[PDB]
Symmetry: C2
Subunit: 148 residues, 2 copies
């Protein structure tokens, strides 16, 4: 018996498909290998037994590392206000999509979504308040359940 | 002639949403002879290539792509455990569970929410039928609108 959050997927498409088959909501965790505040969140909040259970049991966690160096199969040239940028790594890919889809470039950044990508709560960033985080998770969960 | 826009599903889908276009998924392979035959017999047609290049966002999903995933993924399927390790294993698997198909070439036309805009299309070298497939998908897209 050792209650700690287990990161399910790093891959968005496969995580979304698993969640869909298992009728679970998804938590997107935009994070970084060297992200100080992500790690502070992990140690101060994720280690709480109630938070850990909810994330492990009720959500499909997808950890999106914005500093992941894994090469993209081929590079992708994008236009972002207002010049060319070449996306080369998985990390570049996720930094870019966080900005264009959620209007944020910060980590930690948590987004609760349903199986069609609709947000289930407002986003949560860095805040070590355990009960506020629990409210954030339970609210998303109930908004998900109210879809069915 | 037909210029392949994206290999990456998520970035291709976001570009298509930003540009208000439907998406064509092309399940294919580097070593896929029937994919090459289909490209040579049908994509070389001026009207086909014009529709693909101007009206769709093409996403080429190579099922034999060896690029490693960030970390392997264990999957349960029908109903046995398998470990996916490369981008190609990912797209092979997703082709099966999402579209009920395991062969290439396989084409799916989808809207920006991922809803299919037509029956999918497999290997058939009929230019007219392929034009009809594309135009129908395009007509269906423009109707949600």
């Amino acid at each position: 018996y050792t209650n700690e959050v287990h990161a399910k997927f790093d891959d968005y498409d496969l995580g979304m498909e698993y969640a869909r088959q298992h009728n679970k909501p998804v938590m997107l965790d935009f994070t970084g290998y060297g992200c100080v505040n992500c790690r502070k969140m992990e140690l101060a909040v994720w280690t709480d037994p109630k938070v850990s259970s909810i994330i492990n049991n009720d959500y499909v966690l997808i950890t999106l590392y914005v500093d992941n160096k894994t090469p993209l199969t081929e590079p992708v040239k994008i236009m972002e206000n207002g010049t060319e940028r070449t996306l080369r790594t998985v990390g570049d890919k996720w930094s870019y999509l966080q900005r264009v889809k959620f209007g944020a470039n910060a980590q930690p950044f948590y987004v609760l979504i349903d199986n069609e990508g609709n947000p289930l709560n407002k986003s949560y960033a860095y805040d070590e308040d355990i009960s506020k985080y629990i409210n954030f998770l339970q609210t998303g969960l109930e908004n998900y359940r109210k879809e069915k």
